[PDB]
Amino acid sequence: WTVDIPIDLPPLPTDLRTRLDAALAKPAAQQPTWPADQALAMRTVLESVPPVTVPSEIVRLQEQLAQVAKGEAFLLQGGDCAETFMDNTEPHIRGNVRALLQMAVVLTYGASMPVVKVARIAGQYAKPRSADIDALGLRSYRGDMINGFAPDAAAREHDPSRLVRAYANASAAMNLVRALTSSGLASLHLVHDWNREFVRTSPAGARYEALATEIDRGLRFMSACGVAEIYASHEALVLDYERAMLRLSDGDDGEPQLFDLSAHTVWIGERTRQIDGAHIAFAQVIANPVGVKLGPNMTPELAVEYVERLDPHNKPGRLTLVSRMGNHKVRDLLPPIVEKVQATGHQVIWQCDPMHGNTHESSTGFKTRHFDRIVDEVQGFFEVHRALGTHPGGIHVEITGENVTECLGGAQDISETDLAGRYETACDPRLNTQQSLELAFLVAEMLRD
Amino acid sequence: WTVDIPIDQLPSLPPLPTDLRTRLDAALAKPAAQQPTWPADQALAMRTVLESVPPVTVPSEIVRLQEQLAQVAKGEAFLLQGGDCAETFMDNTEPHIRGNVRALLQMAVVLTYGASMPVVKVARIAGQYAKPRSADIDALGLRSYRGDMINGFAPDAAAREHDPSRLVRAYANASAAMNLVRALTSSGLASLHLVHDWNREFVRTSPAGARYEALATEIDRGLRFMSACGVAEIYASHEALVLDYERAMLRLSDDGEPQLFDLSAHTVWIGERTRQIDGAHIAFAQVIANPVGVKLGPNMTPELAVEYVERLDPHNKPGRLTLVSRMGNHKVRDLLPPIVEKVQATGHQVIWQCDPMHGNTHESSTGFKTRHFDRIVDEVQGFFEVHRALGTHPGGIHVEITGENVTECLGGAQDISETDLAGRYETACDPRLNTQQSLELAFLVAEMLRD
Ligand SMILES: [Mn+2]
Ligand SMILES: [Mn+2]
């Protein structure tokens, strides 16, 4: 029923303490409303636990994201919209790890350059809400780090013990993804046989067979000539969790720096990116690579201010700007943002989020996304970058290794009536096994010279 | 004082196949020694939670270990197994885990050079949270401490009661530790040169440094040679003691035939007090695919040793069974030879491993249970003298160590005394070799290994 843990370390450098305290004294949107004394007790437990990631892996990610920023690699970021403790199981994790590897080999062939793989995993347990009371009149579900999905009042109370449950689930998952990435799942030939089974059994396989066959000949060629790292990420939302997981280490200049060891990279969402808020200030104090989500109310001028605050030393790949405009708005809204930022001399990664600007409620009462709109935003994103001569750096996608019925369309041609089949997401609709693979194939075509 | 963390009750996955479960049932119907006395319905509730969690290890890693252990049994590799006697939840921290991983990597590079063949590294880590006790009642009049998977070290009645929620807390700690071990072995510690730079800092600052300096300099010259010519795996292990934990962690994988693996570790061993030939622990080791070890003490007969080979290695797979000698330094040269002769004649290929710690324990006048470095060294040496004389392979060592400057074992370069023991005796059970004493042993066994 309950685990019991008793409460009964070296100080930070004086300047890092001052800066951390100042970041956390700024106002913060979307925080849990639990008591400060209970939060503090939970953070004290987390301050001594083994970290989810280590500094050397974060420094290595930074070097790989620098190549992406310079136009010599591509970033694939993907996973569940919301991880749940309930589905934090071996089959679910393996299914997502495999999906990401499958998409990555397809994208690598299309881009003709390395693909950096960042999973939404081992921490994606918190979400923001526009309304604190939902459609059933209950306090809103804010992810398993905060409260329960169950539609009852007791379940929806904010519960600080979920910080520690979140850590435990994150460690366990990350342990498995490390294991899985040094196993036979690694092998590029095994990973691509899955894609060819997908081509054989998919209703739209004829659309993708030529490209699947060409990839298979590239792999066999490589072998005829004599011839896996998955990073963890989540939205840095709950500051009690992120601050508890900070650790001091010597950074890429040999001086002690603060690393958030809850993940390798984190991003700041649309509702928490206040320029003078705690999330942006917290991002300025940590050594991790960071991303900021940019929606349709973004100005070129605010985008530059984010770049100058978050990438003050002009470190290629330290900052990612994640575009989510809507498929009908991206072609008009993005170019002015890109031009103004390019002119600063900084090298950010431009990443497309084709999911969050394109959501709508179906007549059957399910929030859903159409495949054609998702594809069209990624396409428009590539067009904006071709015209300006800039690098389309990656995609940020929400997916699952399960055959869910959540997003409309694809090869399966999922309808409004089919959405009830198994709509399993705890939050936003995921592209299923098939639809995620389809998009990787379509984006690989977009990447071709 | 303490916080209560809810154990989420989550949906079950498919059950294990019916045929394999029937066989597991027959096996666990045998009597099991040294088990927790918590209620069966509470135990069942916690097993059900553990049956659906992500595993600590995966099958492909275990079949890789079996391949490397096969090389050890054939005389082509050497086994290094070491870590804390008792892992605690309180010391399951980054610095402590990093100190133990580093110590293992430091010992392994020195042993690799001396043996002239690969060294397989198995940590006592990520699950060594349970132990037997001979005593009903300890010296304070309390129920005995049984390790963190069972009860608390603190000397009070409430802490000492058997708490099945500690099964789940043990899993969380094991998972978190393993995650860090995986990260550390693909990090800067992977560098052979970095690891041996710590060995040469050891030679520079040790009082006995002159004893190891020639050999340290030689290893450094070998690494630089390798570099001049143009030119990362640590496994988890523990004593399989608490069957509620080990059975909840069984998972299906494929010989080609469906099989159970214990995915709480890569390899497990059966101790001196639970190795009853007709008991549940040996029966459990029969059913699982993992490589296994059995501890063998002074009361072992060559005949009972042969009964272990026939129970635990029916298919004659080299390296599947490791027999772990712990005789006492004064008894090893007399007692071990006939056991080895009898086993070799069966035609099976076991790994012969030395445990020089557990046969050599004694209590000081100052009241601390401790071990003398000279007795520990003398048993590994006697172990090497036995195998040389029979023409068999001294397959590895099983040692209890830590990466901190503790005062638990007497002797070494620092010449730790009975008075020094009270400085920092930090073990939750047996006296461990500290950072320095561990390294010294590795250097001396490197000399033993030299051709
Ligand atoms: Mn989402
Ligand atoms: Mn011991």
UniProtKB/Swiss-Prot annotation, chain B:
Task: Enumerate the Gene Ontology biological process terms.
Answer: amino acid biosynthetic process; aromatic amino acid family biosynthetic process; chorismate biosynthetic process; protein homooligomerization
As to how many cofactors bind and how, the note says: Binds 1 divalent cation per subunit. The enzyme is active with manganese, cobalt or cadmium ions.
Source organism (scientific name): Mycobacterium tuberculosis (strain ATCC 25618 / H37Rv)
EC number(s) recorded for this UniProt protein:
2.5.1.54
What is the primary gene name for this protein?
aroG
Q: According to the UniProt entry, how is activity regulated?
A: Feedback inhibited by tryptophan, tyrosine, phenylalanine and chorismate.
What is the designated name of this protein? Phospho-2-dehydro-3-deoxyheptonate aldolase AroG
The UniProt family comment states: Belongs to the class-II DAHP synthase family.
What this protein catalyses is: D-erythrose 4-phosphate + phosphoenolpyruvate + H2O = 7-phospho-2-dehydro-3-deoxy-D-arabino-heptonate + phosphate
The residues that the entry says bind Mn(2+) are 85, 358, 400, 430
Q: Which cofactor is essential here? A: Mn(2+); Co(2+); Cd(2+)
Q: How does it assemble?
A: Homodimer. Interacts with Rv0948c.
Task: Enumerate the residues binding phosphoenolpyruvate.
Answer: 124, 272-273, 295, 326
Gene Ontology cellular component? cytosol; peptidoglycan-based cell wall; plasma membrane
A Pfam family that this protein carries is DAHP_synth_2
Q: What job does the chain carry out?
A: Catalyzes an aldol-like condensation reaction between phosphoenolpyruvate (PEP) and D-erythrose 4-phosphate (E4P) to generate 3-deoxy-D-arabino-heptulosonate 7-phosphate (DAH7P) and inorganic phosphate.
SUPFAM superfamilies cross-referenced by the UniProt entry = Aldolase (SSF51569)
Ranges that cross the membrane = none
| Gene Ontology MF terms | 3-deoxy-7-phosphoheptulonate synthase activity; manganese ion binding
